[PDB]
């Protein structure tokens, strides 16, 4: 790894030059480069409705694109789609397997995606003249459990991550295309841009890789943590993304320079985090912890602005609606809570 | 409330009713794990327990048994082990006739001397503080057909005793059973198996009925 050592060192120098450059024009804190900002007052949220329906712990919750429909995934073998405003269930999909750990909802309202712990992914069709929900494809070819499944701007290109590879595909043909690689540990969080042509990921080692679908090679790699990576997300501008690990410290990174911006942390919080979202205004940030609460953390300052603690177990899912009206959270207590 | 949202309420009520019935059909289901260790006779208890994830279902004495078998997943067990809590009992299988050969993974490790390594990792996990561990022992005939020629002293150097089937069998059962770190609420079981049938399913049936007694005692206000 001699040369690696040399060029990684060059890049650390680069990084140091960028840092030198960072320290040059910036306190780097990027907080004192905001010392003139005005603090934001406490935000006390309130529940709106509690979402029943499941019997076991909830392992997935993806929002729709009209900010109206919601899909959740439980461990009983059930994917449930309903209507939030009114808290009514629209459909109820059984599954051949019962060990799913993630779900996706196409940005067209026509298909959903589920898969976990069975090596095979399944794309389900909803609009059928037949009148019932049936399988449309069953992607196979992986040698492990599927961590995350998503849809790429169309109901014809899905994107995945399982044991150790992130692979792309094509719903019709049913064949892989542009199979990503370059990881060492086990991928467990997959994102993508608003005008999605570049996307980032997070395996078991303290690293994160951003991918570009034209060629299928890492555009950038991010490090800095000392534990796993549970949940990563982006920034509404697309030039930033929020990430999380199993060490209570959430970290925010930027693409142009490639190094952290702020760190969030308090002594009273020694457990881990398990989801991070972001509210359209760019100020607030909601983090679901293992302390049965979801502390919100204004992203410009480093202070708490509310404790939306209402759960009775560890929170495994946390989602803000496309239009930023509200947020949805979900723990292992089998109730989804809507906080507005 | 609009002559159309009322039907959406009726449809939602029908979906909820169907989901509650299917979940009740599945509570009265005993779920076992079959976490083994390599080619250690797993396919055999399975081989005759009936008469990625592998699913086995059988019934006996008006009780339905489904077994989850996982050997293929060569991934971080620590990230999917937290999807298996709530299980009644973790059948764990040890081949008695495995102290002689050498595992293909390394010439230093002893098949068994790892066998009890996998046994210790799975028994002290934080997600398994109160769960019974069924233990089976395979291939007793191989153990009593070469135990004269080969000294059990080759492994476990602290052994001081003869080479009879009874003494060796007692020693290996105690040094396997004495890995538990909390004897207050977690129990370990032991049984000897061979090609003989009808003498292995019934042990599984006894262990599982002891687990159900403890659960009802715990959730009724007595224990």
């Amino acid at each position, epitope marked *: 790894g001699s040369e690696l050592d040399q060029l990684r060192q060059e890049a650390e120098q680069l990084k140091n030059q960028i840092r030198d450059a960072r320290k040059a024009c910036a306190d780097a804190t990027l907080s004192q480069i905001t010392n003139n900002i005005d603090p934001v007052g406490r935000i006390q949220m309130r529940t709106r409705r509690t979402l029943r329906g499941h019997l076991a712990k909830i392992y997935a919750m993806h929002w729709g694109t009209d900010s109206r429909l919601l899909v959740s995934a439980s461990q009983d073998g059930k994917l449930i789609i309903w209507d939030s405003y009114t808290t009514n269930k629209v459909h109820a999909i059984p599954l051949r397997s019962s060990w799913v750990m993630t779900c996706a909802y196409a940005p067209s309202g026509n298909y959903v995606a589920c898969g976990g712990l069975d090596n095979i992914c399944s794309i389900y069709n909803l609009k059928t003249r037949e009148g019932n929900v049936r399988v449309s494809r069953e992607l196979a070819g992986h040698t492990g459990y599927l961590s995350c499944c998503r849809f790429l701007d169309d109901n014809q290109i899905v994107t995945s991550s399982g044991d150790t590879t992130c692979a792309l595909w094509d719903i019709e043909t049913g064949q892989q295309t542009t199979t990503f690689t370059g990881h060492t540990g086990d991928v467990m969080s997959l994102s993508l841009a608003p005008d999605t042509r570049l996307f980032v990921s997070g395996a078991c080692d303290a690293s994160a890789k951003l991918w570009d679908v034209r060629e299928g090679m890492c555009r950038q790699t991010f490090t800095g943590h000392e534990s796993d990576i549970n949940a990563i997300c982006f920034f509404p501008n697309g030039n930033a993304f929020a990430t999380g690990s199993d060490d209570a410290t959430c970290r925010l990174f930027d693409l142009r320079a490639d190094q952290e911006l702020m760190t969030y942390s308090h002594d009273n919080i020694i457990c881990g985090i398990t989801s991070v979202s972001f509210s359209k205004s760019g100020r607030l940030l909601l983090a679901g912890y293992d302390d049965f609460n979801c502390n919100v953390w204004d992203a410009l300052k480093a202070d708490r602005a509310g404790v939306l603690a209402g759960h009775d177990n560890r929170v495994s899912c946390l989602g803000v609606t496309d239009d930023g009206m509200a947020v949805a959270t979900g723990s292992w207590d089998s109730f989804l809570k809507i906080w507005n | 409330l609009s*002559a*159309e949202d009322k039907a959406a309420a009726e449809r939602s009520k029908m979906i909820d009713k169907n989901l509650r019935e299917d979940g009740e059909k599945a509570a009265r289901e005993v779920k076992l794990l079959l976490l083994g260790a390599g080619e250690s006779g797993k396919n055999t208890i399975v081989k005759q327990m009936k008469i990625g994830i592998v699913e086995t279902h059988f019934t006996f004495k008006d009780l339905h048994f489904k077994m989850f078998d996982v050997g293929a997943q060569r991934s971080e067990r620590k990230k999917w082990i937290h999807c298996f809590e709530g299980v009644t009992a973790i059948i764990f299988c040890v081949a008695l006739s495995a102290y002689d050969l050498v595992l293909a993974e390394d010439e230093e490790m002893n098949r068994m001397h790892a066998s009890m390594k996998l046994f210790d990792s799975i028994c002290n996990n934080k997600w398994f503080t109160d769960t019974s561990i069924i233990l089976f022992l395979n291939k007793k005939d191989l153990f009593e057909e070469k135990i004269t020629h080969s000294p059990l002293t080759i492994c476990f150097p602290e052994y001081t005793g003869a080479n009879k089937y009874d003494e060796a069998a007692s020693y290996i059962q105690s040094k396997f059973e004495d890995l538990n770190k909390r004897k207050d609420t977690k129990e370990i079981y032991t049984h000897f198996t061979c090609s003989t049938d009808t003498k292995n399913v019934q042990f599984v049936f006894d262990a599982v009925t002891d687990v159900i007694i403890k659960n009802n005692l715990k959730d009724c206000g007595l224990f």
Partner: single-chain antibody
Amino acid sequence: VQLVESGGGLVQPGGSRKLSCSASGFAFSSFGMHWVRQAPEKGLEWVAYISSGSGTIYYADTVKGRFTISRDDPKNTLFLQMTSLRSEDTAMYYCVRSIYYYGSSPFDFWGQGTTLTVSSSDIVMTQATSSVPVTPGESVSISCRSSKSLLHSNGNTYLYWFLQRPGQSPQLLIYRMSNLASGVPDRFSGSGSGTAFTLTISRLEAEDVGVYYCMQHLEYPLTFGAGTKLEL
């Protein structure tokens, strides 16, 4: 998918007769059913409705009590047993399949009916127009009028459009105004507010010849409207 009815013919006053509708090609237990009667050279009429699970069977206004109607799920059969014959009920009868949830399209698929013959408040909603001569390539605008604000606090209105080719059963073109149906070209469009409701056709061709209908779904009694025919 296929749905076929049977049980018509000639009856006599005071008597009784049942109609059986068989459906094949889809899951009958997860859909709701409606009955629409259309007399010879007249408009459409709603008869009954039997939701999934047989919870809420409704009935008509002038047919209530006289009629009865049921369904058999194992056989996917629907039994509508009619009581009196008053000779004013000589009409074809069509069955209609519908489904209701967020984003559903009620009255998708219809079916040829039997030609019964007999030996011898609701939100009023009419269409002023009775006939319009049309040449190919000419844009045509049809207008419907109501007597109540079809909007609701939900934020949507309940209006449905239907077309009937000569010699066959009707089909869906425009459910709720700003929504287009499935299997229909993009030529058609619809709009309106309050009471003024309008349907527009940019380019019209030979095949576009038929009888047009507009109907309400805000309240329990379903009210249809007369036909703005289009001859050529």
